[PDB]
């Protein structure tokens, strides 16, 4: 399952 | 042997044409198993491998919600970078990310990674220690500082060592008939004339799985790896792979050269001649 990415 | 779980994510802006396109594709080893594409009528995470039919509706609902969240976060990211790089809102730009984990034959973690790129160039990435970041330019350095204050490395590491590893094992178990199989390559050689009394010999390897393979041409027991021409191993549309390698030999001595194919589905490597 996928990740929830952090803003740049 | 070892196995991997990887996600390739990309967001591309298109000024004057609406919102950026967002796509996320997941792979177990070298085969696609899930995907989300924002340009679909009603965007949803969808199965791309037959064995994914084993997950219930809750899986699809949760992955979809996370994907829609990522879509919005990357949209904002595109705007943020215009600021870091002092670029205009009129041009198209691209953010790319590769995330994943690999385990050995025993299911234990071998390595984890997460790397970003902006317009085709390295931006920021997690180091092998899974604790610190490396930034390619001063803009990425701003991102590095934000991520350090937010405790991002710890969250990501928890995902790579935990969630990623556990679900990869589950996928390997559910899709064992597909993922743990071996399809032996079928090979043949083609011949093509050329000017100056020379000939092109091409060795083909077809219908194999997994993707790793080695094709070489030999002369007098030596390896002509220096003169060979070839293509990167490629998908054939049904879950199997294909590849070819060629060499130019003088007309008349084709019998002197041989093609060798090494693959896990070949107890003893194949040897072919025209």
């Amino acid at each position: 399952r996928g990740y929830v990415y952090q803003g740049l | 042997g070892p196995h991997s779980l990887r996600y390739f994510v990309t967001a591309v802006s298109r000024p004057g044409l609406g919102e950026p396109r967002f796509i996320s594709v997941g792979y177990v080893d070298n085969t696609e198993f899930v995907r989300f594409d924002s340009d679909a009528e009603n965007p949803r995470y969808e199965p791309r491998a037959r064995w994914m039919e084993q997950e219930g509706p809750e899986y699809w609902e949760r992955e979809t919600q996370k994907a829609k969240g990522n879509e919005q976060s990357f949209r904002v990211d595109l705007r943020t970078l215009l600021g870091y790089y002092n670029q205009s809102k009129g041009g198209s730009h691209t953010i790319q990310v590769i995330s994943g984990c690999e385990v050995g034959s025993d299911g234990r973690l071998l390595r984890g990674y997460q790397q970003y790129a902006y317009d085709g160039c390295d931006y920021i990435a997690l180091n092998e220690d899974l604790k610190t970041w490396t930034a390619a330019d001063m803009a990425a350095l701003i991102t590095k500082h934000k991520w350090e204050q937010a405790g991002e490395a710890e969250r990501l590491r928890a995902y790579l060592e935990g969630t990623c590893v556990e679900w990869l094992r589950r996928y390997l178990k559910n899709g064992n008939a597909t993922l743990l199989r071996t399809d032996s390559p079928k090979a043949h050689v083609t011949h093509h004339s050329r000017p100056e009394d020379k000939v092109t010999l091409r060795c083909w390897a077809l219908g194999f799985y997994p993707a790793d393979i080695t094709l070489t041409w030999q002369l007098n027991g030596e390896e002509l790896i220096q003169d060979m021409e070839l293509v990167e191993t490629r998908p054939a549309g049904d879950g199997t792979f294909q590849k070819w390698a060629s060499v130019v030999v003088p007309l008349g001595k084709e019998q002197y050269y041989t093609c060798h194919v090494y693959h896990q589905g070949l107890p003893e490597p194949l040897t072919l001649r025209w």
Binding site: - | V25, T94, I98, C121, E232, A236, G237, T240, Q242
Partner: protein, 99 residues
């Protein structure tokens, strides 16, 4: 960065007239991502082609596959037409069944 795509056309099985097969058009090593890929049969666009296997390499260039089921005949010809910013003109690669 800008990289021109490499376009490769091939079938799953060695072509035999009257026997079901699969035709592939693998487009690789390109950047930017915007691209248009069409598969053609006797100069006409093939409907419902499947797009799959999108990924990137270590240098970030894009890869993607277009494929469709088909049954070759002695007369039918096939090709793959691609439009990308790295090229002023669209590029068409023809299936060479004797390759």
């Amino acid at each position: 960065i800008q990289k021109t795509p490499q376009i490769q056309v091939y079938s799953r099985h060695p072509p035999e007239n009257g026997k079901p097969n699969i035709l592939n058009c693998y487009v690789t090593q390109f950047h930017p991502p915007h691209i248009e890929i069409q598969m053609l049969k006797n100069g006409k666009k093939i409907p419902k082609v499947e797009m799959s296997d999108m990924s990137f390499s270590k240098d970030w260039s894009f890869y993607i596959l277009a494929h469709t089921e088909f049954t070759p005949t002695e007369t039918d010809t096939y090709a793959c037409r691609v439009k990308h910013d790295s090229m002023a003109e669209p590029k068409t690669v023809y299936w060479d069944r004797d390759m």
